[PDB]
Each structure stands twice: as structure tokens, then as C-alpha cells.
Design a protein around this nucleic acid. Sequence first.
DNA 1: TTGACTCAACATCCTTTGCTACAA
DNA 2: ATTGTAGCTGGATGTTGAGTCA
Lengths: 502, 54
Amino acid sequence: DARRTSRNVCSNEERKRRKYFHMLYLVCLMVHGFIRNEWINSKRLSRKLSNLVPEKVFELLHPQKDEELPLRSTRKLLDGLKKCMELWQKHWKITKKYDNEGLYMRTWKEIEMSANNKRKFKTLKRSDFLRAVSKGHGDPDISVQGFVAMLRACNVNARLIMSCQPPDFTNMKIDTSLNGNNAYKDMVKYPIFWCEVWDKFSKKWITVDPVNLKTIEQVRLHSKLAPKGVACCERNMLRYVIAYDRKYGCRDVTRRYAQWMNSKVRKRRITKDDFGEKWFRKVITALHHRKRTKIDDYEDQYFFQRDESEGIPDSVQDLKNHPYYVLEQDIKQTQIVKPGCKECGYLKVHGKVGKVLKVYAKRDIADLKSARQWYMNGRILKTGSRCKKVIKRTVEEDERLYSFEDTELYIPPLASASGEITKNTFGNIEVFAPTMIPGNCCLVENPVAIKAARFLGVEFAPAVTSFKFERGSTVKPVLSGIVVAKWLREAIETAIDGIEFI
Amino acid sequence: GLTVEDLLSLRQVVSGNPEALAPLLENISARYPQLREHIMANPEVFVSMLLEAV
DNA sequence: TTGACTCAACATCCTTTGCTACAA
DNA sequence: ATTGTAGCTGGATGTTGAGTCA
């Protein structure tokens, strides 16, 4: 209807489909960067590109170590890199426009209709790439890739950098139209691929774009390569800047290029929740084919500091779900400020003169749970524990809340000689945590473990492992299996396996 | 758990024609319902697959 | 050209072991 | 036939985009 498009919010089904498609697409792009990084290492190619760099210039790329003042060496490195940029302009004799948005971000609408029309595709094999780089023919992406290849030929530690642009799974719109005005010029304003070079003298990665922006920079807080402006970020949303090195390393290097990694960028990454964090780590590990170096340590120290100095964000939206900070007003009803702590900063609220909000570090916020809630985590309360907060409930009711320190690990009683378990009022044992299994016992989870145990006539207890919440008006216990004594495990497992004969 | 034909295309697009991802990925995932669940739980497996047969 | 609002329509989290009426 | 079962969770809190305003 009209109210559907007025909303401009897609279904929940679409949300999930976009999230999955985002991942799939990301993985493919990251794998593409891995493979392309191999090609760049090509031996047949490097012997050819080496000859583009005069001896005089080669020396500048490998300056003498300067004791008194290492800066002078950095200076000489940068000068070498500059001359390399210059003669690369000379080498690359024909530049092509991107035929269709290159590797910039596509819209969902574009992706939906891409399946619609079968387009002709000129295949690019590994050899074609090499031939194109040596002859100096191709779009801007192929150009920088060629450039990284030249630097490596000169035995400099040059990374290929890829800014991955999967479609934005945060974009929940139905209609995902773009402004056509100066569409191309804005799209190519910042590059997708560039280069980074290690400086052993100052111990930092130097940023190099010899193709698009034609600069060399030593990034502290600001980078000329991070896209800026609403227009530009419609085809270039910086969230996964990946570095590939000579020795087949793969590092997420976004921290360098995002001024607001923790507040803005984080929100737009698959990494924004615990599952996606682990998921992304899995992709990286899969592309990271080398051992850790001292260089990794230096870059991590750089990243650790960039994290320390981003600080509190300027705006309320950017503090929604931040990994380090919370607004006073966003502290959950079930949380308290740790004794002796206060705000760690303030936020000027845009729109109201002198209006200010108190900002807390999350390390100073404590999570509380009720007695029942702790039991669901296999915990009971200590003797003479006092509750830290009291809160309302449902059909009200005053539930008391306790801190982790007021709690103890629940240890259940052992099974008897005959294998008898002590069970609750319904004749079952509650097992919400490994901890909740008796020491001389084991948990066997199987749709037929009960039928089995009854058939052997042995001593057991049905295991309530969780609760299914359902329609009607009624909660239900999930009896997902069995707790038996340890010495009866294989008997049980044999019967289960032979359930059809019972 | 793909065919010979699709795995060939996928590797070729990923390696030398990533501009052609969108329709290929649109097509493939519509014909392989399981893939969704595979990528989500086992992305590394998928990765090494693509890195193979070269 | 900005971000903090409000609005409204969903989505997601937290709940954590029934009750009544009636056909056979 | 005095048992077997069809039918009757939400309520507080968070996320999303449009729109308006200063």
C-alpha cells in the first residue's frame, strides 16, 4: 500500500536476507582481494616492472639507517615513494573509466534487478591481468594493483589495501534510489584500492595512493582517503579496510582510516554483535596465511592508541550501543553504577543551549540479576548476601537483584550407589549449565533417551534444559533428555541406538 | 555441496570478474537453499573451497 | 547542512511446569 | 462416559525511516 512505501521499511524477512547476502558478498570480495594479491606477487611480472625503477630511485627506497635522527631516513623513503608515483604516471599510458560502478557499493534495488538482465562479460584470466599491467592498460583499480607489484619488485614491503563494499545491510529501505547528479564524479572521488608501505625507521605504515588522489600520507587522526560527504558515502561506505601483504598476511586495517571506528563505523559492520564478531574473525583467519611478526605488534600498539584517543562522540545517536560508553539515561533498570564511580565525561546536546548529558564508561556499570535469574545460570546466593536494588514486575511484584559477587556456583548433590538422582517436585532435574550436572553423572540429550532409560529399568532423571515460550497463555518446560550416573552411559547409548527394537 | 559447473563460475567471477558478483550470487543462492546456513556457521570452509582448484 | 526531536509501525527481549468446557 | 483435549501468552523496550524544526 501507500502506507508501506511511506514507511519505506522492508519486511523482517528482507532484513535477514540482506544480512545474509551482505556476508556472502563480503566473503567473496575478501577472497577476491586475497587472490588478486597473489597475482601481484607474480614472478614473470616483477622481473619486468623492476626495470621501471632507476638505481638512484631504488636507493631512496632503502635508505641507510640514521642513528642521530631516524627522521632523515623516513624523509628519504618518502622521496623514493614520490618518484615511484611519478614514473608510474609515466608508465600507465591508458586509463579506462569504470564500466559499471566498478567495485563501489551497489544498492539493493540494483542487486535485485542485476539478476534480471544478462550482461556480456569479458573474462579476465591471471595472464590477462599480467599483460595489462605490463602494457599499462586498465581501469584505476588495476593501475594501483600494478603499482603495488612494482614496489614489491623493488623488495619494498608494500600492502595492497582493499576497501570492501558489500551492500549495506543496515539500509532497511524498500526504495533505495540514488541521486543521478554528478553520480560518476562523486563515486570516483575516493579509491577502493590503494597501497601501504612499512617504514622501519619511524615504525609505522605509510599510506600511498599513486592513482586516484595522488598522495602519500602518514596517518595520525585524519586520512585523505576516508570518504567524506553524504553524496560520496552513497557509493563508498568505509567499514572493511583490509590489508594484504607479500607473505600472504591478511589484516583488518579499518582502525587507521575510520576517525569514528567505535561510534559510527561499528554500527555499520557485521561485527556489531557477538555472533558477527566471531564470524568475521573466522573469515580473516581463513585468509591469513602467515605467522605473527614484530610489525603486527607495532601496528596493534598504533590501533590501541587510536582507540584510546577517539574518545566520547559528539552526538546522541552515536552513543546508542557504543562498546565503551553509556549515556546516564541508557543505563538499564537492571544495572547500577559501581560504588565510587562517576561520569567519565559529558555530551553537549545539539539544539539546546547549555543542555548536557552525563556519559559513563561501561567498565563502571554493573549487571544485576534476580535469584531465579541467577539459578538459570546455575548460581545461588551467598549466606548473608544483601541485594543491591529492588524493582517492580508482572501480575505488581518487588523482585530483588544481586551482583555477581553475592553469588556462588551451585554444586548439585551426587547420585547414590544405585544411581539415584535427587530431583525437583515434578520428578525432574534442572540442568541449565554444565555446572548443574552432578559430579558422578552425565547428561544425555536425545529425543528417545527417556524411552530408553525406562526400558532398561535403570535409575535416571529427565532433564529440563530450558523453557519453550508459546501461545495460548502457557509456558512449557523443555525435557530435552536424561541425567544418568556415569557408569550407565554406554548402556543408555546402546539402547538409544537400538530404540526400534524396544 | 555444489556442482562442477557452478564452482567453476564462482571461482572465475571471484578471481577475475568480481564486477559480476551481484547476479551470480543472486542466482546461486536462489538455487542452493543450504548455502545460507553453511556460510553463517562455517565461513572458513567456504573460503578454502574457493581457494582450491587453481 | 546539522542532529535532536517526535511519530508509528514493527521487532525483540523477558517471561521460566494451566484452566475451562464439553464430547464420548 | 467423570477422561481426553480444543481453545484461549503479552508488555516493556529497542529499532527503523520520514518528517519537522531550529
